[PDB]
UniProtKB/Swiss-Prot annotation, chain A:
It comes from Homo sapiens. Residues 2-75 form the RRM domain. It is found in: Nucleus. This is RNA-binding protein 12. It is linked to Schizophrenia 19: A complex, multifactorial psychotic disorder or group of disorders characterized by disturbances in the form and content of thought (e.g. delusions, hallucinations), in mood (e.g. inappropriate affect), in sense of self and relationship to the external world (e.g. loss of ego boundaries, withdrawal), and in behavior (e.g bizarre or apparently purposeless behavior). Although it affects emotions, it is distinguished from mood disorders in which such disturbances are primary. The chain holds residues 855 to 929 of 932 of the full protein.
From Swiss-Prot, chain B:
It is found in: Nucleus. Residues 2-75 form the RRM domain. It is linked to Schizophrenia 19: A complex, multifactorial psychotic disorder or group of disorders characterized by disturbances in the form and content of thought (e.g. delusions, hallucinations), in mood (e.g. inappropriate affect), in sense of self and relationship to the external world (e.g. loss of ego boundaries, withdrawal), and in behavior (e.g bizarre or apparently purposeless behavior). Although it affects emotions, it is distinguished from mood disorders in which such disturbances are primary. The chain holds residues 855 to 929 of 932 of the full protein. The gene is RBM12. This is RNA-binding protein 12.
Length: 79, 78
């Protein structure tokens, strides 16, 4: 299972919108975690996982810069 | 950049409460991320990142079974 990072999401994003964004890509549905700063507010960042390293890589290639709402999401490959 | 998982926290928890739990360890700023299940609901679980693997390892060894709220938390990884 390889985890990628998602950044620049709008602050109103929902788990469903994240799952929809990766529609067609086999993201594991209960793997999403959303980051929040020290003041308890969402940072626009998330970690999401895929069943294989090859699927994480393909999502990162094909979906980097696609939108979620009005923002182009930034994806960073597995580490 | 080494993360551990935290489980069994109360479902309503603030980042503030989590950072207190880790007071003294070097939690990477902004790396606390609350895990949501398939239904998109809170779960009392989170990923937390530390600057070094040795830091993560100590956190897990020194803080396992300590509480957040009235629940004893389970730490694992990295």
């Amino acid at each position: 299972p390889t985890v990628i990072k998602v950044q620049n999401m709008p602050f109103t994003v929902s788990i469903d919108e994240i799952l929809d964004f990766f529609y067609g890509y086999q993201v594991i549905p209960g793997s999403v975690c959303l980051k929040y700063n020290e003041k308890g507010m969402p940072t626009g960042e998330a970690m999401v996982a895929f069943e294989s390293r090859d699927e994480a890589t393909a999502a990162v290639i094909d979906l980097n810069d696609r939108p979620i709402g009005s923002r182009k999401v930034k994806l960073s490959g597995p580490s």
